[PDB]
């Protein structure tokens, strides 16, 4: 949607990896079946020993889910943001 030339960078898939890691740390994403914190140490003992599927599948195929719905994004994201128009479908 831009006039052409009469004679915005797409970041590489590698550089996005650091960007992807930040979103999992800040709890915007979460794993598909993330049980989370256990209640007791004995229960956590099993968790620290067991190896789930997500710890072995590749970094680019770990299924996540979202804590914020696009409606809440559109309620919070400033309208001055360029991607505001992409908040909806």
């Amino acid at each position: 949607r831009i006039p052409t030339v009469a004679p915005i960078k797409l970041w590489l898939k590698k550089d996005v990896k650091n960007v992807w890691e930040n979103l999992v740390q800040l709890d915007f994403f979460t794993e598909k079946s993330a049980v989370g914190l256990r209640d007791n140490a004995t229960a956590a003992f099993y968790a620290s020993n067991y190896q789930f599927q997500g710890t072995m599948i590749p970094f680019d195929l770990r299924s996540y889910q979202m804590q914020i719905i696009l409606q809440e994004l559109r309620r919070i994201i400033p309208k001055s943001n360029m991607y505001y128009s992409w908040t909806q479908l």
């Binding site: 590698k14 990896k17 650091n18 890691e21 620290s48 020993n49 190896q51 710890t55 072995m56 590749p58 970094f59 680019d60």
Partner: protein, 557 residues
């Protein structure tokens, strides 16, 4: 019984492994001379090979020691990293026995690293054990200088990086990062990488990778590296030959084929073929005695038959007929009187082939004067044998200045066939690169190629049952398969074969049962399926039902 045990130990003229040739006409002395001549070349070959191999390892340890003690004056306490690309768990590293700093090597296998808790304890356990020979947590690292009065330098050897759980390893690396608070501790990390740095860059968190990259050295230790050592060994094979033996185009063709099927361990596979071919010549060819022209006086009429059947001699006789040579000369040599051609054969033994000298000249000329290193000597020698070296030299644009010098003229010297190595009957393939899957299938199908009164009619059940397996579907109703197997059996002949035993009562007791044929078929069927289970032919559905089975292999694939 002893066989029921897991394992058990058993205790029990002067033989030479070689066997008589010429149907036993070969003399005792000749075999020993054959035995000695083989050892002379075989030992000569290994002396150069072992020196080369030991030289390679010395260079690796020298480089490894250099990197480990290439002390870089980084202002920040950080790891020292070495990436061993294409390495294996077999390599070993030894450290300096310094006075002020206690140097300890720490091995970390994936078996020793299921979780971070295990990693910290086991690492400290090994650290304390080594420290115990001076004269389980990080407090040991803090207390080390007060306990033992010496500085600690730790080198962690990740013996196999690929199998390590990166989530555990990523956490553990951060755990070790707390050691930089201490002033008396220094840490180095060694990575055994098989494929490339790309596997590390995916699974590790990108925050962790920035720790490693601050101080790292990148090294390749694979055996295959620019044909640097393959050419030397192959040339040394020519050197230990001393022109006493030659190579055919077919034999070098076979070597070039199998060299491309392994990426990092060609040298050991290359050594197999060369030594096995060297072994084959001495055990099979009787003319290996005449490697030394002193042994010429041992000739017999049987050896002349071999000489008579040489391709360079078969057409040479017809050349005399077709060029009107005297028939008396032809009669004299064929009826073995005065045997004057043996002197010509003596000349061929003496005659040094310029192939080896020219090739060694070209190799040195390429290495030193043309400065070409990215080349294969096996390809270089093969083109020489075919006489297509000019096309091979055309691969490099710098050969124009010296194509006339590097051009060579191959000559098919008479009786060279008796001193060449070739692949002609597949004896170098049936035992070194076998069709393991194909041979089993062929033996299952074509039993007559193995085996030489019911025995004369019915083939073994194991091979016969395989016929139905090929005809069967992916999933099998075993009851239908059992019936199908039963229908093919010679019931009346088998029953009459069972009844042949006059005193084996237990066989005759079942013979009275009309259901014995069903029982006998099932006993043969169930036993065969169990053998199929062991061979990997069949897999059961026991979770659903033991009465259905699934195939696990197909013929011809």
């Amino acid at each position: 019984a002893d066989a029921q045990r897991s394992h058990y130990t058993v205790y029990p003229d002067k033989h030479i492994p070689f066997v008589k040739l010429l149907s036993g006409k070969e003399s005792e002395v000749n075999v020993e001379k054959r035995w000695e001549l083989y050892h002379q070349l075989h030992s000569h070959f290994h002396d150069q090979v072992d020196h080369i191999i030991d030289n390679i390892e010395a260079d690796l340890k020298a480089e490894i020691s250099d990197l480990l003690y290439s002390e870089t004056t980084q202002k920040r306490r950080c790891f020292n990293t070495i990436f061993l690309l294409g390495s294996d768990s077999t390599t070993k590293i030894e450290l300096k026995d310094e006075s002020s700093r206690y140097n300890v090597l720490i091995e970390l296998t994936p078996k020793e690293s299921p979780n971070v808790r295990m990693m910290l304890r086991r690492s400290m356990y090994k650290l304390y054990s080594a420290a115990d020979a001076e004269e389980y947590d990080l407090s040991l690292v803090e207390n080390f200088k007060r306990l033992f009065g010496k500085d600690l330098a730790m080198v962690f050897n990740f013996k196999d990086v690929d199998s390590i759980n990166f989530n555990t390893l990523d956490n553990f690396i951060i755990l070790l990062k707390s050691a930089f608070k201490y002033d008396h501790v220094k840490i180095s990390l060694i990575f055994n990488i098989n494929t490339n740095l790309s596997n590390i860059e995916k699974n590790l968190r990108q925050s962790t990778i920035r720790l490693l990259k601050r101080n790292y050295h990148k090294l390749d230790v694979s055996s295959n590296k620019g044909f640097k050592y393959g050419n030397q060994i192959f040339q040394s094979f020519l050197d230990t030959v001393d022109g006493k033996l030659n190579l055919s185009d077919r034999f070098v063709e076979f070597i070039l084929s199998k060299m491309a099927n392994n990426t990092n361990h060609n040298l050991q596979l290359l050594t197999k073929m060369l030594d096995y071919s060297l072994m084959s010549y001495f055990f099979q060819n009787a003319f290996s005695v005449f490697i030394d022209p002193v042994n010429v006086d041992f000739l017999n009429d049987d050896y002349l038959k071999i000489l008579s059947r040489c391709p360079t001699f078969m057409f040479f006789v017809e050349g005399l007929i077709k060029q009107h040579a005297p028939a008396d000369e032809i009669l004299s040599l064929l009826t073995n009187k005065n045997r004057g051609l043996e002197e010509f054969f003596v000349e061929f033994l003496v005659r040094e082939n310029p192939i080896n000298g020219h090739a060694k000249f070209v190799a040195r000329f390429l290495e030193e004067e043309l400065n070409i290193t990215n080349f294969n000597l096996i390809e270089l020698y093969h083109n020489l044998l075919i006489g297509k070296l000019d096309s091979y030299l055309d691969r490099w644009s710098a050969c124009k200045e010296y194509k006339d010098r590097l051009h060579f003229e191959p000559i098919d010297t008479i009786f060279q066939e008796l001193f060449t190595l070739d692949n002609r009957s597949g004896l170098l393939t049936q035992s070194i690169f076998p069709s393991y899957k194909s041979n089993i299938e062929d033996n299952l199908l074509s039993w007559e190629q193995v085996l030489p009164d019911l025995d004369k009619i019915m083939a073994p059940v194991l091979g016969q049952l395989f016929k139905l397996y090929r005809e069967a579907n992916m999933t099998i109703n075993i009851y239908d398969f059992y019936i199908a197997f039963r229908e093919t059996l010679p019931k009346e002949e088998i029953l009459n074969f069972i009844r042949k035993d006059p005193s084996n009562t237990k066989l005759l007791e079942l013979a009275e049962t009309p259901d014995a044929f069903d029982k006998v078929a099932l006993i043969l069927f169930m036993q065969a399926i169990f053998a199929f289970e062991n061979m990997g032919l069949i897999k059961f559905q026991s979770t659903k039902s033991y009465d259905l089975v699934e195939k696990c292999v197909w013929r011809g694939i």
